[PDB]
């Protein structure tokens, strides 16, 4: 037994202020973000949003990795989060067919 508010700092993306969705980690410093957050951010910076360390000399996307273990932890610990995110995706696609 643990208070979720005690865990939140370790499960949350600073770029959106919410839980990690598709957690993605900068290999140089190991700070983690949602995939969409960090990809968009690195369009206009090559430095980590948190610690300012250079992600890559020129092509910062080379130096990020999907962090499956971290995301797995997130979805296992945060009640409702995975179901919620899965539903948002279905709802999106039902209103936006291909």
């Amino acid at each position: 037994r643990i208070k979720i508010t005690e865990l939140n700092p370790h499960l949350m993306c600073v770029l959106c202020g919410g839980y990690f969705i598709d957690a993605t980690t900068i290999i140089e410093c190991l700070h983690s973000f949602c995939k969409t957050c960090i990809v968009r951010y690195l369009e206009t910076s090559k430095y980590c949003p948190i610690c300012d360390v250079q992600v890559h000399k020129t092509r910062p996307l080379l130096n990020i990795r999907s962090d499956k273990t971290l995301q797995d932890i997130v979805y296992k610990l945060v009640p409702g989060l995975f179901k919620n995110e899965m539903k948002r995706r279905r709802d999106f696609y039902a209103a936006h067919p291909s």
Binding site: I2, L7, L61, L81, F92
Partner: protein, 96 residues
Amino acid sequence: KTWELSLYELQRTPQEAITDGLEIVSLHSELMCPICLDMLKNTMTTKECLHRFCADCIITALRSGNKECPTCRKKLVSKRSLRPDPNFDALISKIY
């Protein structure tokens, strides 16, 4: 990857925090070192593959002359292929 965002991804919005006192009560295949099959201590993380190991365990594997990642067998040149993961340790401190 190319890191291309899907139509859903391009418009997704945050998953907001749970800020009530909701307590939490399975995490073995995530907080466990695959070498000693014990819980991670002083987590070290491979840069290329993001595989986590106890500092002492991975340093030991590398020192034996096996320069492969124990989890995925990717080449590891040295301990400079590894970063400390204090933020993983911190999570483990609170949960256990």
